[PDB]
From Swiss-Prot, chains A, B, C, D, E, F:
Keyword annotations of the record: Glycoprotein, Sporulation
Keyword Glycoprotein found: yes
Keyword Glycoprotein set for record: yes
Entry note about domains: The N-terminal half is required for localization to the spore crust, while the C-terminal half is necessary for spore polysaccharides (SPS) addition.
Native organism: Bacillus subtilis (strain 168)
Subcellular location: Spore
Gene that this sequence comes from: cgeA
Protein name listed in UniProt: Spore crust protein CgeA
Domain of life of the organism encoding this protein: Bacteria
Annotated consequence of substituting T52A: No change in SPS layer formation
Length: 67, 67, 67, 67, 67, 67
């Protein structure tokens, strides 16, 4: 029902997206990893080693793709 | 009922608009593409290739047109 | 009932106001144009041609007048 | 009941206060004028002519006094 | 029940704390004075004379101590 | 049920994480200490002496790990 759950549910892993959130924190190019809906948590990670980011889907504004 | 639904429903695709959101993320001149209302989702895209931005209508503050 | 509806209902068109919103987006000197209350929408516009701005009244913080 | 209504109800007019809102917009030193509680609207103003500010009490974070 | 009420209830007066709010307004080193829970209002004050700041507890994010 | 409760309950103490909140206040490299889920409060602290931070979990956006 929530738009965030759908726009994150059908994204195949491995594609790089840029996500803007309710706080205005502009998160740069991050390769999508996973999204589990039963609890509503999306695993992403960007190169740093490796830096894994864990955010809450219900407070996600927008996702942008690149082609 | 929601103002965001109507201000995005009767706007023809192809027109360039500038949208300000609840997080203050000022998105520049972007050409409209589509707005599917049944699940409340709107598509925009700006030149980059092409950069498609996908946002949630319910958390959309304001749209501005140019003439 | 909502304070924003009242502070926008009795403003005569043509007067310039400065409006601050919930995102901190400071919108400069804009001449008021219209405010239709049944759906809660306010038409404003500033000189650019002309740049028309559409915002949601329910998510409007404050308006300031000049004398 | 609401704390904002209480902190605005018994401030005598003419005293200078500095208010801070939910958007982080810091209002500078202004002279308090009025607070009509039946609809919940505060009347403040700062010197410019005169610049009158109309901000909803329900979305006011904090007020600071000076001695 | 609210975490802010508890973290402000057991803080002894006179200790200097740094508080972050929902608007991101970072308030520097300020000595705690009082917090009355029945109406949910907390008083702080920093050196300026004296500058007393009055905020609403329900919209307080976090407090930090120093040792 | 809340995602923040999950991402905080099963982090072992001693690991350094970087948290981001609803206000965009970015918390730097801070070693996690504790999380009392009964009242929903996370205990963290960073080197200064020592500076302890007390931030409500329910208004926490995201946590990031490092490897």
């Amino acid at each position: 029902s929530l738009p965030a759950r759908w726009i994150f549910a059908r994204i195949t892993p491995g594609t790089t997206i840029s996500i803007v959130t309710d706080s205005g924190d502009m998160i740069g190019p991050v390769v999508f990893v996973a999204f589990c809906q039963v609890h509503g948590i999306v695993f992403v990670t960007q190169e740093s080693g490796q830096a894994t980011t864990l955010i809450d889907v219900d407070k996600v504004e927008s996702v942008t793709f690149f082609s």
